[PDB]
Amino acid sequence: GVKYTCGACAHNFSLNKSDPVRCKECGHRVIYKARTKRMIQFDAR
Amino acid sequence: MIIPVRCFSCGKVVGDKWDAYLRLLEEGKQEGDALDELKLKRYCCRRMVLTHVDLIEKFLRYNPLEK
Amino acid sequence: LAIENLHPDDRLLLVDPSPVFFLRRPQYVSDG
Amino acid sequence: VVASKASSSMLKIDQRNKKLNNRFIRKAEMAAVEKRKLR
Amino acid sequence: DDTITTEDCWTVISAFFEEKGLVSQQLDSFDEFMETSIQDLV
Amino acid sequence: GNKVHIGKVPIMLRSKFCSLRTLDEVDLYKMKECPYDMGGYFVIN
Amino acid sequence: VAFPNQKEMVRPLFVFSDSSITHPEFDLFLRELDAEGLSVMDLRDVDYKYHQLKEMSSRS
Ligand SMILES: [Zn+2]
Ligand SMILES: [Zn+2]
DSSP: OOEESSSOOEEEEEHHHSOOSTTTTOOOEEEEEEOSSSOOOOOOO | OOOSSBBBSSSOOOOTTHHHHHHHHTEEEEEEEEHHHOOSSSHHHHHHHHHHOOOHHHHHTTTOOOO | OOOTTSSSHHEEETTOOOTTEEEEEEEEOOOO | OOOOHHHHHHHHHHHHHHHHHHHHHHHHHHHHHHHHHHH | OOOOOOOHHHHHHHHHHHHHOSSSHHHHHHHHHIIIHHHHOO | OOOOOOOOOOOOTTTTTTTSSTTTHHHHHTTTOTTOOOOOOOOOO | OOOSSBBOOOOOGGSSOSSSSHHHHHHHHHHHHHTTTTOOOHHHHHHHHHHHHHHHHHHH
């Protein structure tokens, strides 16, 4: 439901809150969430 | 980290002179002569290019986090 | 050739209209 | 490594500046020490 | 020969720091502990 | 009677028994290690 | 895999296209099956395949 990114091979995937925390293709134990889809605005100051 | 756009003290735009400065230094020109050739008169501007340390060339050596 | 190869008398003709030990030329990699 | 162009230029500048410093500073120190000796 | 200036002293110091480093004592002590000290303690 | 396991000794970074003693300059970047890091410390928890 | 009219073939995965099967394509497949004398998958078997894929895709 929510995307994730591996910490070594930078491979995108998704998890269903029941899979083991692991990259599907290289088996790394550290993954990162992906950026939000909301709008990000800055004041340029 | 990367060359500032404007000189802090007065506000002259020095962000477009980093590549030219490196090119001039490559040809053997001295630092003072290189800064003079870029028309940087005030020493407030000269310290911006003279004392800049380029750290982004070290941050770029790390493998990008996405693909 | 360079300024050194110029004749000393011709070098004397180069008059401003010497290095000092405490003004280094800037570096970027340092050493260690 | 495949270093970028800016990094290679900086390395060349650093080598040239190191050589020039090692020459000129030593020459100036040698010029000063003899004057301090004869005084 | 020729005289030794300050720049030569800094060349020697540069050689020192090129070989030793700044935290050489910590690493040397730990290497000594792992290589021989554990066996002798046993 | 053979190699019985008696414990685990923490390893000082950049020492002779550290994994970063080898790996040169290029691989030090792939492991997300700063080449300016000097070692001399342990990592506990 | 194998075409009905044609013979058995070993193919890699990327040969298949993500685009949906069109009406003339399915009609030609049916005509080839009739020429060979074969039938279509039963609706019960279609449901069994659908359940198998749904279980496999949502498995942990
Ligand atoms: Zn991975
Ligand atoms: Zn300025």
